[PDB]
Design a protein around this ligand. Structure first.
Ligand code: ZN
Lengths: 260, 67, 1362, 99, 68
RNA sequence: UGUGUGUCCG
């Protein structure tokens, strides 16, 4: 009687217990899915710091950029229109790009204003500076000739002809820099400038085993009076290292040389 | 006989009930900890974005009266 | 009588535009100015009647109508003007020549005697010493030309007076040359045979004015030609002659001292250089200065070539040679030079290149640049040069500007954090700077290596103001006796109406700073700040900004700016605020040489994240002013505004300058095409322009220097090197420390250091070019141990002598207020002291000074400009002619006793003296002993005390009450006060100068000296921090005779004229000297008799004076012994025992100080023969509460209270004595300041006021080369005989004595090793600890001061507390 | 004791059924909340990365600009400053570049 | 017998009450999750607004710079 | 009659 009734009531209770278990596992799997979908919320918590860093950096940079430019920033369209007629740059500053402005400069079609051209050339010419070539001079034939002339006493001396032939050989051989450097070093170490010129004509490898130049001469009027003691008859096989500076040839097949 | 089996069945059902209750409590604790981890830090990120939005709005307001 | 007083020295630019007027009056032809308006204008009332003068017509009766420029003739006049003519001056300057020589000889002898008395003297002296000096003086080349030029200068200076009608002319005929003068105009008549010719047959001077055919027709049969110039050329020539004579005399005399090798170049090479320069100028005209300007860089390169000669050391000389060759070839192409002239014109730089001298001789030769004259300036060329670089368009890189701004902010923050405790409480939403938050919370600062990624974070930092705008502690900056510009309303009223062609409608009233400062009704610092903050400088009447050409130089022209009065005040206030506000975060000084610093300290300083080798390079900042644009300097100006409480103050210049009209305010050439119709809107032409974008030199210099330092720091951060910067004059030197390991020898260290320096130079060039300023790589040079900077020259740690810059500027005549003799003698003495501070030869400078002193005395006695012609000062003031004996005696007693003596031999050892009175007494005693006139000491030192107040006592605490030792300052101050009485409606100065100011001054001065015992230095220190000091510093603003004789406000006070008072006081002063035995009493000599001690006699002399001030109270803290009297030397042999320390030192012994010589040589250039050429190893209390950004008044009250508390330590009146002084300065009451006063606890307050406070820095008067080779042991004194010994002066005396003793002998020839200085037991005393006691109180009402400025201020505690 | 046992069992069944219903309702609410993934998490996560990339690109590009100085910056700044305080155009005559 | 049955019924009722109170506490704490909903809605707008701002910024950068 | 012909910032 009552035992059977308790039996089916407890059976129903057990069934509802299985639906309780079903509900429990359903909510557990829902919580697991929520956790799986929510796990990518603490990952922006880190990259937001990098976002803040880059945003603040950009804010500072562009705020300072707009601070320096007044109320006449002269948008690019206005500048391009202003360049066409009365090509002077527009009032107020303007903004370009390095590559774009270089490209416009290298093309002879846009007719970039002259002032902008020279300003950009001045700005750009200083980027080719390295450890060397900072204070390095540029040396030509005439400059080296004048530098050598300033160190010698008197005029018309055979040393002047020696300097001239040395600078000519350096010019057509393209070795002036090393000659000047070692000449300056020799002049610094203490010897006489004539001894220095001897060092140039004896030490430079290019000057080794060289024949002196032949110069056509009219008469004794052309040759300076200070070198008449240095005229000598030419022997066969002249050599610069032997003491040859030049060869003078007359009209009537006369050849003479100078001895140092 | 029948009474003992019914008692055993009820005991097993109650054991399962308390086991799932403990599991639910553990899940509650873990989600409470997860929420606590996302309570103060999320406020910190919120105020940081507030500041960034304010400064960016100031910048664009400055830029607006230029074009 | 007159309101004119022409100067005796050249101090103005040379312009010859007005001469075109004179040539039009006489009928000649000349073209000096480029303004065509001067061709057909109207002549003034004067220089028009020149056609009515018989003398001018007679002079110009046999000369061609054509003339020549004067700049082609100056060398010709210099070479061909000896003294042989007939000058109108009656007493010729050559008449009193021999006497001068005699005096010179005497002085030399005295010096020798003095040295022989000290113990220095010389080894192996030569008997033939005076004869060589006499021959050298008599054998000078420029001896007679100097006297002739001085006669000419006297004539032209006298003739420039008589501004009224009926002017006269003077005439001089010197053999070949004829000179005529008429009111600041000179006509020179010269033969034509002396002018170099052209290839076309005309002189080189006439090429630019005439064609070949016209000039030949104009000349025809004539032998003389006439040139016209102003009176400034004559003064320039006189200065050139004096400089050449001084240089030649010094060079000749120096050879006698050291025949084998002297430090001066030569006496014959310099003559060749002078001749070469003169020839080059005579050929090339005024353009030869472009070549003369290369003397300094060539000498610098030649000095640069005295080292190991690395591969790049010769680059500078090569660049200079190329530049000078290019310029020489460029500036002569048009001129038709003959081949002979072409070869002979290069001799100048040919000689300069080929020189072979020691570096010291080259450094001495470096200082003769201005011995050839100065060019002729034009307005148009200067305007063209300024217009370029100022209207040019630039390109900028924003990233470099951003980094520079960040570095600026970082430097300011770092400087604030280093002092003032901790961070500055950054506001503004801290999360925007993540990375700096940790440092702020931990209260630390980033070191340096890690501040490279958080640099942008410094942009967001915000703060309250860090500095205050009420810290002006000196009121003399607002009144300085200068000139300003005029209002825009009457901008054209500064030009001559006759040249302008129209009378200006509106005229100005005054043009001087003092004549406008006193008439500003509402002047105040807060008023100035309000005026600046309201942008009130943009008003239509406040935009003039005139230009002005600079003084003597070698450029084509440099100009500075002049502003109206209120904008000038704003500029002065901004500079004052920046001087002591910002710019302390960017120090520009240091001057540290790695060869004279400790090894470990250098290593620690050079560490960024082992021997340290440093390099350096120098750059020039003079063109930076015109290269600054608003787009680059805007953020820095905004930040400077924000750091203070101001809004639009620091950007006045960038706001008001482009709106101005640029012109040069020259009296004789207004802007081109100026007419009455276009007066309100004048056009721009060759001498004017409208758009100016760059800066101006001088204005805002501190901000620009700060920006440069920020750029250097940015470069230092960018590249991992340690950089130090120094800025002075127009140059900045930057040194780089490289730090090297131990195993790297010493060969590649120099190469690596120079490589690092080149890297730094290239990076800095790139950065600065990106900022818009371009460096020139062809002039910047890199070296590894040679540094030249302002007044210092060092070569690998060895100081090079450079003393010709000051020794060659000595002159008998100088502007010293009404040609005062005392001022001239004082200037000569200071110049001699400064010159002897350098070099290693003593005799030449003293000989030159002695030569010039007597000449100045004579020329002032016979040719004073303040009186009429023929007036003799030395006759009527005495009744008899003044003789050599009286002058020689009156040039020997020192000035502290009233005796016109300033060449103290004691100064040869050290600069600042402990007690002038004792030193003067010793000098007089020694001089009187040298001659056999010993029985005159008492009558000479007795004198008669004068009448003086307590103010005079507190002005000079270490003085005496004799009328002969006073200056003209009191007279000028009385005149200024009298002028203020009937003027100065300023309404704020009037409050300060009330009716009873003088009585209050007297009461305060008397009260300060009522202590017991009486101390004068303490009273003088306290007196400067009261309203009395402010009144005194405002009163003393007069500086020149012209403003004294020409001021409208001063000369409109009726009463007796200033000129008569000046003549009377000059006569009285001249009567005071040279008289003798007329102003002495016979009551003090008995008291001074039988003393035989300088200290006691000086004390008695001081006590006898000021008798009416000090009734019977003792006087302390004013007397100190002379250093020579205290110590005696023995010059111990290396193997010898001291007689003093052994023979007579048995019972107790005598203390002494020891000097020993080192042996390490380190470095030497060029040799180690001389001691001066080598160097050696060996280096030569908190308050409870500190306020933040205190005002000037608060600070001054703080130290005043601290001093009063500390001096009266044993008394209980300190609570009441302080209050009356603070009632007029600060709003805080007593017992509130006391917690801010730092605690002090010491004794013997005399020593605190002597050295600890350091009123003088002492220092030495010799080169520091020898000091590194000696070691001084002072602990041997033991109980120190806490005493009267000043240790710094002892060290200086020992070093100087050793240096002078061995200055010509070789290093090996030195036979002495150790030196003993034994102290005598006569002039050394013991000082006790004494505290002043005040028995009364001031009880004076100082509450009436409730005004602005340095006076009582409200709410002083506004900056907060720490 | 049969009636009281039956009543107690029925009450227990009703209570457990109510528990099942409320658990199902909570499950449905959680599922509804998770339907959109709370909504903004994914697209704001993508937007954060996109913004970071854009800002980095702009910062990198900022290092390649060249500025040309104008001849009217000072006049414009002065006019703006004079308008900010006591707003009124500056007094005549006109400045260097009135534009 | 009957005593064991009634004792186990009482234990069942007690455990049922414990389960019910645990369930209602779980529901009360689940409905307290709306706090996590505050930094979801409003924050979204901020990010979106920030995006918009950045977007227009880029546009403005193309109106001033000359570029290619 | 030629306003003090000029002589500034450090
Ligand atoms: Zn001894």
């Amino acid at each position: 009687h009552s035992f059977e009734e308790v039996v089916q009531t407890l059976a129903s209770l057990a069934t509802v217990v299985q639906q309780q278990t079903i509900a429990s596992e359903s909510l557990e799997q829902r919580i697991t899915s929520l956790e799986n979908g929510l796990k990518p919320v603490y990952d922006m918590a880190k990259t937001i710091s990098s976002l803040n860093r880059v945003c603040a950096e950009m804010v500072a940079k562009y705020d300072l950029l707009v601070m320096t430019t007044g109320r006449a920033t002269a948008t690019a369209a206005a500048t391009e229109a202003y360049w066409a007629e009365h090509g002077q740059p527009p009032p107020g500053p303007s903004l370009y790009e390095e590559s774009a402005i270089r490209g416009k400069i290298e093309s002879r079609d846009e007719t970039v204003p002259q002032s902008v051209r020279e300003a950009f050339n001045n700005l750009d010419s200083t980027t080719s500076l390295t450890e060397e070539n900072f204070g390095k001079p540029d040396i030509s034939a005439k400059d080296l000739r004048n530098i050598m002339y300033d160190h010698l006493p008197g005029f018309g001396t055979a040393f002047h002809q020696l300097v001239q032939v040395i600078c000519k050989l350096g010019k057509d051989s393209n070795s002036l820099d090393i000659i000047h450097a070692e000449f300056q070093a020799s002049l610094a170490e203490g010897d006489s400038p004539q001894c220095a010129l001897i060092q140039i004509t004896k030490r430079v490898p290019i000057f080794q085993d060289a024949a002196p130049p032949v110069i056509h001469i009219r008469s004794r009027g052309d040759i300076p009076r200070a070198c008449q003691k240095s005229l000598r008859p030419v022997p066969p096989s002249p050599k610069i290292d032997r003491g040859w500076v030049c060869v003078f040839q007359l009209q009537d097949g006369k050849t003479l040389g100078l001895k140092i | 006989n029948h009474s003992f089996e019914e008692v055993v069945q009820t005991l097993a059902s109650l054991a399962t009930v308390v086991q799932q209750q403990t599991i639910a409590s553990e899940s509650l604790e873990q989600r409470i900890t997860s929420l606590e981890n996302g309570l103060k830090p999320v406020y910190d990120m919120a105020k940081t974005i507030s500041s960034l939005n304010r400064v960016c709005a100031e910048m664009v307001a400055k830029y607006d009266l230029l074009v | 009588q007159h309101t004119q007083y022409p100067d005796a020295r050249l101090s103005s630019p040379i312009v010859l535009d007005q001469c075109d007027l004179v040539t039009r009056a006489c009928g000649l032809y000349s073209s000096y100015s480029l303004n065509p308006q001067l061709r057909n204008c109207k002549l003034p009332k004067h220089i028009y009647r020149l056609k009515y003068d018989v003398t001018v017509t007679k002079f110009l009766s046999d000369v061609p109508v054509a003339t020549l420029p004067i700049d082609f003739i100056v060398p010709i006049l210099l070479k061909a003007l000896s003294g042989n003519g007939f000058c109108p001056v009656e007493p010729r300057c050559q008449q009193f020549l021999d006497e001068i020589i005699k005096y010179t000889m005497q002085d030399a002898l005295f010096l020798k005697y003095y040295l022989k008395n000290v113990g220095a003297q010389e080894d192996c002296v030569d008997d033939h010493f005076q004869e060589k000096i006499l021959s050298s003086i008599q054998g000078n080349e420029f001896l007679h030309q100097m006297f002739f030029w001085y006669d000419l200068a006297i004539l032209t200076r006298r003739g420039r007076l008589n501004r009224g009608n009926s002017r006269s002319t003077w005439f001089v005929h010197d053999d070949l040359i004829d000179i005529l003068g008429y009111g600041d105009y000179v006509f020179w008549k010269i033969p034509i045979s002396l002018l170099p010719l052209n290839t076309q047959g005309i002189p080189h001077a006439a090429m630019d004015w005439y064609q070949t055919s016209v000039f030949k027709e104009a000349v025809q049969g004539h032998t003389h030609i006439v040139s016209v110039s102003t009176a400034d050329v004559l003064i320039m020539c006189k200065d050139l002659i004096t400089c050449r004579f001084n240089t030649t005399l010094i060079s000749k005399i120096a050879e006698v001292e050291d025949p084998v090798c002297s430090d001066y170049p030569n006496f014959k090479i310099v003559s060749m250089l002078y001749q070469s320069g003169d020839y080059l100028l005579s050929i090339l005209g005024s353009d030869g200065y472009k070549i003369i300007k290369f003397l300094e860089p060539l000498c610098l390169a030649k000095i640069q070539l005295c080292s190991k000669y690395t591969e790049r050391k010769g680059r500078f000389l090569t660049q200079m040679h190329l530049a000078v060759n290019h310029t020489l070839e460029e500036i002569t192409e048009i001129r038709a030079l003959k081949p002979s002239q072409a070869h002979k014109i290069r001799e100048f730089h040919r000689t300069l290149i080929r020189l072979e001298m020691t570096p010291q001789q080259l450094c001495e030769l470096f200082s003769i640049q201005k011995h050839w004259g100065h060019p002729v300036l034009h307005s148009e060329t200067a305007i063209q040069k300024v217009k370029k670089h100022a209207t040019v368009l630039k390109a900028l890189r924003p990233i470099v500007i951003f980094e520079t701004y960040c570095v600026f902010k970082y430097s300011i923050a770092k400087h604030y954090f280093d002092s003032q405790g901790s961070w500055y409480s950054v506001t503004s939403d801290r999360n925007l700077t993540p990375g700096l938050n940790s440092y702020i919370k931990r209260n630390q600062f980033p070191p340096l290596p890690m501040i490279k990624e958080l640099l942008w974070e410094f942009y967001h930092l915000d703060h309250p103001p860090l500095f205050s705008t009420k810290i002006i502690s000196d009121l003399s900056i607002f009144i300085k006796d200068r000139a300003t510009a005029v209002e825009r309303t009457c901008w054209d009223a500064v030009f001559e109406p006759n040249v302008l062609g129209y009378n200006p409608p509106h005229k100005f009233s005054t043009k001087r700073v003092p004549e406008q400062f006193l008439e500003q009704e509402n002047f105040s610092i807060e008023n100035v700040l309000s005026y600046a903050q309201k942008l009130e400088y943009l008003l239509p009447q406040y935009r003039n900004f005139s230009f002005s050409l600079k003084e003597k130089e070698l450029n084509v022209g440099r100009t500075f700016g002049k502003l109206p009065y209120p904008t000038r005040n704003v500029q002065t206030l901004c500079e004052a605020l920046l001087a002591d506000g910002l710019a302390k975060a960017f120090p520009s000084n240091m001057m540290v040489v790695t060869e004279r610093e400790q090894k470990e300290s250098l290593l620690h300083q050079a560490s960024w994240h082992a021997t340290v080798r440093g390099s350096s390079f120098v750059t020039d900042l003079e063109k930076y002013n015109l290269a600054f644009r608003y787009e680059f300097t805007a953020p820095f100006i905004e930040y400077c505004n924000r750091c203070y409480g101001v809004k639009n103050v620091f950007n006045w210049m960038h706001y008001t300058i482009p709106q101005c009209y640029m012109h040069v305010s020259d009296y004789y050439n207004p802007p081109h095409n100026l007419t009455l119709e276009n007066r309100n809107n004048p056009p721009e032409g060759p001498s004017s322009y409208r758009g100016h974008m760059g800066g101006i030199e001088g204005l805002q210099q501190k901000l620009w220097t700060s920006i440069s330092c920020a750029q250097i720091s940015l470069v230092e951060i960018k590249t991992g090197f340690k950089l130090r910067s120094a800025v002075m004059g127009d140059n900045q030197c930057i040194t780089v420390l490289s730090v090297f390991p131990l195993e790297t020898d010493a060969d590649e260290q120099e190469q690596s250091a120079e490589d690092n320096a080149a890297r730094v130079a290239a990076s800095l060039a790139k950065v600065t070019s990106a900022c818009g300023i371009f460096l020139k790589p062809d002039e910047t040079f890199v070296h590894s141990g040679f540094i030249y900077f302002g007044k210092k020259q060092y070569l690998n740690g060895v100081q090079l002598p450079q003393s010709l810059k000051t020794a060659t500027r000595m002159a008998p005549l100088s502007d010293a207020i009404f040609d005062d003799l005392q001022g001239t003698l004082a200037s000569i003495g200071t110049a001699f002291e400064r010159s002897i501070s350098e070099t290693r030869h003593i005799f030449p400078c003293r000989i030159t000074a002695a030569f010039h002193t007597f000449f100045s005395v004579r020329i002032l006695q016979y040719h004073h400009l303040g009186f009429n012609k023929g007036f003799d000062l030395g006759q009527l003031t005495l009744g008899k002619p003044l003789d050599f004996g009286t002058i020689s005696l009156a040039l020997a007693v020192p000035q502290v006793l009233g005796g016109l003596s300033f060449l103290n031999p004691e100064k040869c050892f050290y600069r600042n003296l402990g007690d002038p009175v004792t030193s003067g007494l010793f000098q007089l005693k020694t001089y009187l002993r040298m001659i056999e006139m010993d029985d005159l000491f008492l009558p000479l030192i007795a004198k008669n005390p004068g009448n003086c107040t307590a103010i005079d006592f507190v002005l000079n605490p270490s003085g005496l009450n004799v009328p002969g030792s006073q200056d003209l300052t009191s007279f000028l101050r009385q005149i200024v006060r009298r002028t203020i009485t009937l003027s100065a409606k300023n309404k704020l100065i009037n409050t300060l100068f009330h009716a009873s100011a003088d009585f209050e001054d007297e009461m305060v001065c008397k009260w300060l000296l009522s202590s017991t015992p009486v101390m004068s230095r303490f009273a003088a220190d306290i007196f400067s921090r009261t309203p009395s000091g402010k009144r005194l510093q405002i009163l003393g603003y007069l500086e020149g005779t012209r403003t004294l004789l020409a001021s409208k406000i001063i000369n409109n006070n009726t009463e007796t004229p200033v000129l008569d008072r000046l003549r009377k006081i000059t006569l009285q002063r001249w009567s005071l000297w040279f008289s003798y035995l007329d102003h002495c009493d016979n009551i003090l000599a008995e008291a001074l008799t039988q003393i035989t001690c300088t200290v006691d006699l000086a004390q008695i002399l001081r006590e006898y004076s000021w008798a009416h001030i000090l009734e019977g109270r003792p006087l302390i803290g004013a007397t100190l012994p002379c250093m020579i009297e205290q110590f005696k030397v023995v010059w111990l042999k290396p193997y010898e025992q001291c007689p003093q320390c052994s023979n007579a030192k048995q019972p107790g012994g005598k203390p002494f100080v020891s000097v020993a010589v080192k042996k390490h040589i380190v470095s030497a250039w060029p040799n180690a023969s001389r001691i001066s050429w080598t160097i050696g190893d060996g280096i030569p209390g908190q308050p409870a509460i500190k306020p933040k950004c205190p005002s000037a008044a608060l600070r001054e009250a703080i130290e005043l209270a601290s001093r009063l508390t500390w001096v009266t330590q044993g008394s209980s009146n300190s609570d009441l004595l302080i209050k009356p002084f603070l009632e007029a300065r600060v709003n805080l009451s007593v017992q509130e300041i006391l917690q801010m006063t730092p605690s002090h606890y010491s004794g013997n307050i005399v020593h605190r006021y002597n050295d600890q406070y350091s009123p003088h820095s002492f220092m030495a008067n010799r080169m520091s080369n020898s000091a590194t080779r000696l070691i001084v042991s002072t602990n041997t004194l033991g109980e120190f005989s806490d005493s009267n010994i000043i240790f710094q002066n002892v060290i200086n005396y020992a070093v100087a004595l050793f240096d002078i003793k061995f200055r010509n002998t070789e290093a090996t020839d030195i036979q002495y090793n150790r030196a003993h200085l034994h102290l005598t037991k006569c002039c050394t005393r013991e000082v006790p600890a004494q505290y002043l006691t005040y028995t009364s109180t001031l009880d004076l009402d100082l509450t009436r001061y409730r005004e602005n400025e340095l006076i009582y201020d409200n709410n002083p505690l506004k900056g907060g507390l720490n | 004791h049969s009636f009281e046992e039956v009543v107690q069992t029925l009450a227990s069944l009703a209570t457990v059924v109510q528990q099942q219903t409320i658990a199902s309702e909570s499950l449905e609410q959680r599922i509804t909340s998770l339907e959109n993934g709370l909504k903004p998490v994914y697209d704001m996560a993508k937007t954060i990365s996109s913004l970071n990339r854009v800002c980095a690109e702009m910062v990198a590009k900022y290092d390649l600009l060249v500025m040309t100085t104008g001849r009217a910056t000072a006049t414009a700044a002065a006019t703006e400053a004079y308008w900010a305080e006591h707003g009124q155009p500056p007094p005549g005559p006109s400045l260097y570049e009135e534009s």
